[PDB]
Every structure is written in structure tokens, then in C-alpha cells.
Design an enzyme around this catalytic site. Sequence first.
Site, mmCIF file in Angstrom:
data_model
loop_
_atom_site.group_PDB
_atom_site.id
_atom_site.type_symbol
_atom_site.label_atom_id
_atom_site.label_comp_id
_atom_site.label_asym_id
_atom_site.label_seq_id
_atom_site.Cartn_x
_atom_site.Cartn_y
_atom_site.Cartn_z
ATOM 1 N N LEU A 1 0.825 -1.194 0.000
ATOM 2 C CA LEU A 1 0.000 0.000 0.000
ATOM 3 C C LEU A 1 0.866 1.255 0.000
ATOM 4 O O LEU A 1 2.053 1.232 0.340
ATOM 5 C CB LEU A 1 -0.925 0.008 1.216
ATOM 6 C CG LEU A 1 -1.984 -1.092 1.302
ATOM 7 C CD1 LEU A 1 -3.014 -0.740 2.362
ATOM 8 C CD2 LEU A 1 -2.659 -1.329 -0.040
ATOM 9 N N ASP A 2 0.249 2.362 -0.393
ATOM 10 C CA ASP A 2 0.886 3.664 -0.496
ATOM 11 C C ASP A 2 0.423 4.547 0.660
ATOM 12 O O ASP A 2 -0.423 4.159 1.470
ATOM 13 C CB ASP A 2 0.560 4.293 -1.851
ATOM 14 C CG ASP A 2 1.472 5.441 -2.198
ATOM 15 O OD1 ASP A 2 2.707 5.261 -2.150
ATOM 16 O OD2 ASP A 2 0.949 6.525 -2.526
ATOM 17 N N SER A 3 0.994 5.751 0.738
ATOM 18 C CA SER A 3 0.569 6.699 1.763
ATOM 19 C C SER A 3 -0.927 6.960 1.667
ATOM 20 O O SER A 3 -1.654 6.881 2.667
ATOM 21 C CB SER A 3 1.335 8.012 1.616
ATOM 22 O OG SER A 3 2.734 7.820 1.690
#
Lengths: 156, 109, 51, 115, 207, 325, 76
Positions: free
Chosen positions: G36-38
Site C-alpha cells: 500500500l501507499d501513503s
Amino acid sequence: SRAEYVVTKLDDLINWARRSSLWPMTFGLACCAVEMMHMAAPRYDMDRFGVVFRASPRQADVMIVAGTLTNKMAPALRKVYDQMPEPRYVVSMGSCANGGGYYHYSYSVVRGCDRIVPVDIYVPGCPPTAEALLYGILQLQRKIKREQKLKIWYRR
Amino acid sequence: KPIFSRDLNEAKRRVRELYRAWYREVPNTVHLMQLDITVKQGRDKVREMFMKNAHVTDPRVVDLLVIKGKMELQETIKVWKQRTHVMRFFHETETPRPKDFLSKFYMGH
Amino acid sequence: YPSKETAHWKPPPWNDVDILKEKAVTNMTLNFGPQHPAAHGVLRLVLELSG
Amino acid sequence: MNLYTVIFINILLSLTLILVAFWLPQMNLYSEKANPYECGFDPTSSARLPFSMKFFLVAITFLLFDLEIALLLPLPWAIQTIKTSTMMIMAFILVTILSLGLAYEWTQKGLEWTE
Amino acid sequence: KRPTVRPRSDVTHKQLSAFGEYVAEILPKYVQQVQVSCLDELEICIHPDGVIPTLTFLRDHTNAQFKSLADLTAVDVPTRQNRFEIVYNLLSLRFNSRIRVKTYADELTPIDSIVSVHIAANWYEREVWDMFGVFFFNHPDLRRILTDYGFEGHPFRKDFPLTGYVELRYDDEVKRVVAEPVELAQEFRKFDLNSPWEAFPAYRQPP
Amino acid sequence: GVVATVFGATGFLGRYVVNHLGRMGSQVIIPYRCDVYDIMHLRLMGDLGQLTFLEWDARDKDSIRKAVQHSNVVINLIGREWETRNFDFEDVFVNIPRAIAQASKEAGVERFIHVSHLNASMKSSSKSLRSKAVGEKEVRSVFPEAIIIRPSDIFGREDRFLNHFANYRWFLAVPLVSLGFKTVKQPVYVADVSKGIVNATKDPDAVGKTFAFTGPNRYLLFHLVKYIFGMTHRTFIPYPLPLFVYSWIGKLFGLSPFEPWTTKDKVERIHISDVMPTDLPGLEDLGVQPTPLELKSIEVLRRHRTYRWLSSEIEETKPAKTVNY
Amino acid sequence: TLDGIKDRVLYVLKLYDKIDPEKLSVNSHFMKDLGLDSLDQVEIIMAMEDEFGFEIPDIDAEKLMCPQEIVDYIAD
Ligand SMILES: NC(=O)C1=CN([C@@H]2O[C@H](COP(=O)(O)OP(=O)(O)OC[C@H]3O[C@@H](n4cnc5c(N)ncnc54)[C@H](OP(=O)(O)O)[C@@H]3O)[C@@H](O)[C@H]2O)C=CC1
Ligand code: SF4
């Protein structure tokens, strides 16, 4: 004579009604609305021809685009044109509305209201004289006179 | 010199708060403006627009981007921005041109 | 005499005034113009009105 | 009967006008046309939201004054009485009571609209 | 004297020079330059940090009641390091006089909003932000004002194309007014009307 | 460099065809018979001098020749869902297409694009479909390289399909043959069909072939109508009704002098099940990715709701059940 | 009820679609593991706020990298 003759006379009555009573929407964008006001004024008196303004688009027939149409204004102009009930006609008065006018090469002007709504009459000028706009209204009335919707229906 | 955020970390905090705000507002925007899109599509568009500026590294530029995004968010929260103005983020009138060299050679220069 | 149902009750305020939640005022929003007789045709006055 | 007939004829004339108005013109329907009106821009909220009334007190006063008219309307028959002294005393007292109520509201600033 | 030449008076010029020295010595911490043009128009160029102090002084001080903010403008000079020059034109009714105050800003160096001093700036600063991209600190409601709602760009910048990048038309397929890249039937003609000969020797920049 | 004559521009599909041609920037010729007022919507679809409106009559072949004079492409969208007092299905789907095709061949048009129907068969129960098959044969006889396009049902804002079904609310309950089941429908999107026609106006491989433009999914008529009424948050009261009674109701409705709400042939075509692709090219051959009905149904059906349900999300309606026959 | 907290957290993490259900685990760093990303983790936190009817400041939220951290925070 024939059902065709009766239909033609009926459509003539139809067009007489429409052209004798056409209620422009109270709509003006820039300079040219001043010449529209002057055509309302006593000297020319639109009302003599049966042309009386109405504020609501629901109670209007002809939209007179009188002045520059900007990108920030175009959606609202289209919305009021749509909300006009049919039949409805469009008279683009002034150079700003016919094409782009003085501001044709600007980042914020729609180069012709006919890019947003289908125009019925074009009145050249910057601004057109009140007599020129009146001539445009008469030309629109002639256009309405030559309609023959009912004859087209009967032939169809 | 700092516009607001001293450093990229504070700028990122501001950016993430803005993303939260837009993500929260998308459903209300769709419901109120009667858009013919889904909440998934709206939030995907929000993500795409945020990522379109992911290359920036200057805190000042990030601050400017966040300020303008907040302005757009206010404009959308309030219904100043209409449906015609919002559906421009989707470009559903554009026919994409190809990136193929031969295709470009065929069409134009 | 406490009950399972009365458990969630609280004694009334010492003076009958209750600390009631802030009430949202939703003043009506009107787009006075641009296509308005009195808006001069190119003014979108967004009015927040109470009545 | 002569009244039911004319009222029904008026209702039927209005209904026939409505029927002609709706079933004669050629109609072209779409969402952009049928949407609500608001000076060319989309409404920002429903029209069913509360719409504050700044003359509510004057309205609830109008109710009582309307009932006062109810009490005053039988005067044409009342004046036909042999107890004209009593009828006059009663009419004067009623009208003066109404006047005192109006004056009290006026002074206490009930006739002023809320802001 | 000479019918076709504007008549010039020195009383106004001397008064403006005196008042310019006056303001310069009253605010040494901010004033960077002062000049009176041959049109008789006092012009005080300040550091961007002194905008609020300078305007508060020029409005409140008895000998300078420049209480009317006639104009707040920005001029774009791309070459210099600080692109935008913010110009305040002020009027003093008590002394029937006008002054000009100038500062500078860049795309990433905001200026302090003077809405506290003059409320007239509430919209002029918004216009400056919209048309040039100069940001203002502590503005009650800074946002676009003149451009389209979703408009991207700052038109009055000299690097902005005259006709922009986008235009609107009605698309029947979607039943909306759609924004598309600009295509013109006839492109703008940029006539080159600059002569090789210098017209004014008094403004000859040294080689 | 395309000059295209669209012979059915003033219609549900003609407007989209003209719009896409104008976007492509090709000169368009619109032969019309209606009133000038009915073409105003096309008036703004092209820049200056791009569109040329000229009056025409199916009877007069001089008008057809004039229309197809300087055209490289001739698109024929002529059609009609009821038999007019002067024009019937035979005329509309055979005589006029044949005359247009022959005039185009004589003039020397490079491409001729004729639009028929997916279920157009010589043995079809429907008069319109049976006439359309003969029209295909005659067009391919008099213009041997003519392209043939066979759309399924087309749904859009101005359609006679989703609107037709949503209009059943005026009759309280929905009568269906076999209660909708035993009837498979594969509706295509009008924008997809228009894009397909415009692309076929230039696709080199399309000449002389026959295409079948069909949507991505196939629904049973019952599930499709159920989805339509779910979108237009109306009460769906379906009930069965034998085809002979349905055809009698259509006969009744088809007696109006104006545009009938429904007709015997209309109910016949509503209830005849769509066929399967079966080796015909399809939209993906011309490069149009068919758009599912689920995405574009809201923009067509939102105007049939009452205030309560006007502002309802596309995701508030359960998607139909798609068969795999 | 820490077990109920952890069950709701896993329910929301599985109702989120970017992650991989089989690979999703109580010990799976959003950034390092799941991928996942920010912004993805921001949406995860917003989903947790939805489920628990509880707000979360950004300062506190930036650290909730794993479901165990999420449930420990919900313990509050
Ligand atoms: N569901 C659908 O819409 C489907 C459509 N098709 C086919 O696509 C084509 C387009 O039909 P569509 O446009 O969708 O519906 P329309 O009925 O709107 O098409 C009618 C067109 O034909 C013209 N026309 C009809 N009769 C005549 C005539 N006697 N002389 C001259 N022109 C005439 C009309 O002009 P005016 O209206 O001005 O008279 C109009 O342009 C038809 O062949 C149709 O069968 C294929 C599959 C399904
Ligand atoms: S056309 Fe000329 S007169 Fe009319 S609004 Fe434009 S600039 Fe003014």
C-alpha cells in the site's frame, strides 16, 4: 379544396400566432443590451409589434444573446436556453455574439454563441442599431411565417 | 523561505489532510450534483489528480499546490462549481491520440 | 432503584437548563442571477438568506 | 341547482383548458429542460428546506382577529333588536377590546418583523 | 509657451520630493528607493516586509492621510529575479495628493495582505492572485474572482498564451458544455511593428 | 478529406453520427425532409461550412442524386418503427435504400454504409425485420461492396427502448409475454454504434463486410425491465400476457394519426429474442469498446423518477442478471 | 473487547480491495508488505474511522502501519 389546403391554412394560423406573439427573455450580457433597451424605448417600441419581455425562461420564446459570452457564463446561457419550452428561437445580436467580436482572440470568450446554442438570426454590428435589431426581429418573424410544420406532418 | 510548511514532511501532512477532505467530500458531491458517475470513480479521479503532482519535491511548490487544491475543494463543497465544471476532470469528450511512432507518422507529423 | 434500562439515565441539571448540542443554522442559499432582471445579466449574487 | 350547474361548468371549462394545453402542443422532454429553475445555475439545495418566517407573531394574531371578525359579522341582524342599548354596549366593548389588544401588541413591538 | 507641449510646474515636484525624503527618513527600515517622475508622481519602492507598516503609516499619520486605496495592481517583468511588482496607488483627500508604493514578489514568495489597513484590497488582492499567481498571507477569503471556476493558469502572466489552452463548446453526445484544447480557424497575427531606430535618446541603456 | 452524406441524420442515431463526423472534421451533407426547426440541434454540430443542409424527398430521385453528388461516403440511416399512411415498411426499408444505393453507385461514391438490424431475417415474425432482410439483399445487389451494419437494440437519451419500457408506469403494471423469460436482449449503446459507423467510414478492412454491433451483456427481458424499473425507482408489477392479446393492444395503440406509443411490430420485435454473434465481426473489429448498460442507464433513466428518488446513486440499484446463452 | 476490535479491523481490511485477501494478515506492513501507499493507508484509516465511529488525528494515524497497531490504538 383539399385536406392539404385546410392543413396549410391551419399552419398559417399557427405561424401567425407564434410570430405575432413572441416574448424575448429578459437577457442581456454587455453593451448590446443597451441597444436592446433602446429598441424597447418609445422611439421604436418593440411592444407595438407584440414583442414583450418576460423574466422567466419558462415564459419566453426567443433568446436574444446581446453581448459577450464568456467561458464562465456559457453553461448558464445553455441552461436557460434548455429551460425555455419549445418552440424557441435564438437571435445573436452584436459581434461578440455572432462570432468573437473584439475579444475573439481571448482566453475567456466563447467565439460565437452559436458554439453553445443553435442560432436562428444573426445581427451584425458593434452594437447594432436598435433599428438593425428590429430588422432582425422582423426577419425572424418571416422565418416563423415560412414554417409549414403541419403540412410536413400531413405529407408524412 | 517557508510559505507554510517548514519541510517536505509538514508539506506532506498538509497534502494528506487535503486528500482526506476530498475523499470525504466526493460522496456528497456526487449525491448533490446528480453526477452520472460512481463514488468509486470520483475517488479514483481524486487519487489520479493527486498523483499527477507526485513528482514535486519543493515544499513551497507543494504548499502552492495544496492551497489551490483547497480552493477547488471549497468551490466544490459549495455548489459554485456546477456539474459541467466537475465533469471536466474526466475528459469524456477526448479521443486519445496514440504514442506509436508509426501512428504519429500516419496522422500528421 | 437502578435498572438495566435506567442505567443510561443521568440526573437532571441543578437548574433546569440543559447543555444542549449546538444547533446548525442552514440559511437558504439563492443564486440571485446571472439571468435575473435585477442582476444586470452577468452577476451571480450568492445570497445566504434567513427567510 | 342553478349554482351547482354553474360551478360544475366553470370547473369543466378549466379542466378542458388544462386538457387542451397538455394534449395539444408538441412536447420534447429531457432532464436539462425539466430541471428546476434558478437564474441559469443549478440549485445548491432543495426548496423543501425550512424557510424562516419573520411575521409568525402577526400570523397568530391574524387568527384571533379573524375570529373577531367572526364575532362582529352578525351585527346586521343584531341591530334589528329592541335591546339596542345592550347591543350597542356589547359592540362598543368588543371593538374597544380588539383595539386594546392591537395597541398592546403594537407597543410591545409584536407588529415588528423578526430579524 | 509652446502650444503642443504639456505645461510643467515645479511647485508640485518640489513638494513631492520633500515628502519623499520625509517618508524615506521616517521609515528607513523598509524604504529601498524613492523617485518623483517628470509627471509629478511620488513613488516609494519598499521591501516586501514593510507593506503593512508602510500603508498603516501612510494612512494614519497626520502629515500623510492617504486614506483611499485607489488601486492595487501587479506588473509582470519576467527578466528580473522577482517577477511581479505590486503597485499600490493611494489618495489623500486631506492634502489632495496621490502617492504610489511599490514592492516585489515571486511565484513562491507571498506578500502580506493589507485588508486590515484598507478593506478596499479585499478584492484587488484576489484579482492579483487570480491573474498573476501572487499569494497573500492572512487574506480573509483568497480565491479566484475573474477567471472560470475550474480555470487552471494565471492569464495575465506574460508567458501565458493570449488565447489560453482551452475553449468551450456544446457537445450533444454528453448534453453539456465541454472544455477542449483550443483550435482557431485563423491564428492570431503578431505584427512586427518595431523600428530599428531608437526614438528616445534620453532612455539609452549603456552598452 | 471525407465528404459524407447522412440520409437519416434527423433521428435518434443520425444526430450522433453527424456529431462524430463533425468531430472527425469531415464535410457532412444532411438531406432533410422535416421542418427547418427540427434540424437546429444538428445546426451547431459543425464549424463553418462543414455541414450542408439540403431538402430532399424520397419520391424525387433528382434530390437523391443532388445529395450524393460530391460525396465519398454515403451513410443510410433511413427507417421508421411504424407504417406511415404514405410510407410503409417495404418502402422505408427496401425502395428508399435501394434508390439511394443506386444513385450513390451512379454518382461514384467510394463507400456506402447501410444500417439494418441484428435480428433482420427473411423468416422473422416481424414485418420490419423481414423487410430489412430484403433491403439488405437489394442494397448488396445494387452496390455490391456496400457495408452492412446490424445493431441490436440501441439505448440512449432519445431512444424508443429504455424510454419505452420506463413509460409502462403510466399503465400501472407491465404486461410481458412469458413474463419476460424466454427472451434474450443484448442492447448496445448509441454512442458506440455511432462511433462504429464513423470508424467504418474509413477502416480499410470494412469494405464489403457485414457487422453486428451488440452490447457486452445479454439479459432476459424480465431482468432487463426489472433493472429499468429499479433505476427509475418505480413499482415493478410484471404479469404474463399472451402474444395475441399483446398484438391486439399494439394494434389499438397503432391507430393514432401521430407517432404511436406502441405497435404490433413493436411488440413483436420487443419479444423476439436476440441471436448470438456467430462469426460476425462486431464493434471491437472497428475499435469501439462496447459500453455496458449499467454505466449509461442513469443518464437515460434519471428523468423518469419522482422527486423522492431523483438524486439516487447508480450503485443504489442491483445490477441485472446476465445470461450466457 | 480486543478480540471484537481485531475482528472488525480485519473485516474492514478485507472489505478494502487493493490489498490481497489471502496475503492480508494481522502482521503485514501496509507499505513494506502488502504494498500500500501513503494515500492507501489514509483510506484504510478512514475506513477504520467509519467502522468504529471514531475520529483519528493525522499525527496519530501516520504510524498505524499494521492491523495489530490499529487494534492497539483502538484499545485507547
Ligand atoms: N433501436 C434502434 O433505434 C435501432 C435502430 N436501428 C436502425 O437504425 C436506423 C435509424 O433509425 P433511428 O434513427 O434509430 O429511429 P428514427 O425513426 O429516428 O430514424 C428515422 C430517420 O429516417 C428518416 N425517415 C423516415 N421515413 C422517411 C421517409 N419516408 N423519407 C425520408 N426520410 C425518412 C427520418 O427523418 P424525419 O424523422 O425527419 O422524417 C429520420 O431521419 C433505422 O434503420 C433503424 O431501424 C437498428 C437497430 C435498432
Ligand atoms: S458586439 Fe460590440 S456593442 Fe455588442 S456587446 Fe460586443 S463589443 Fe459591445
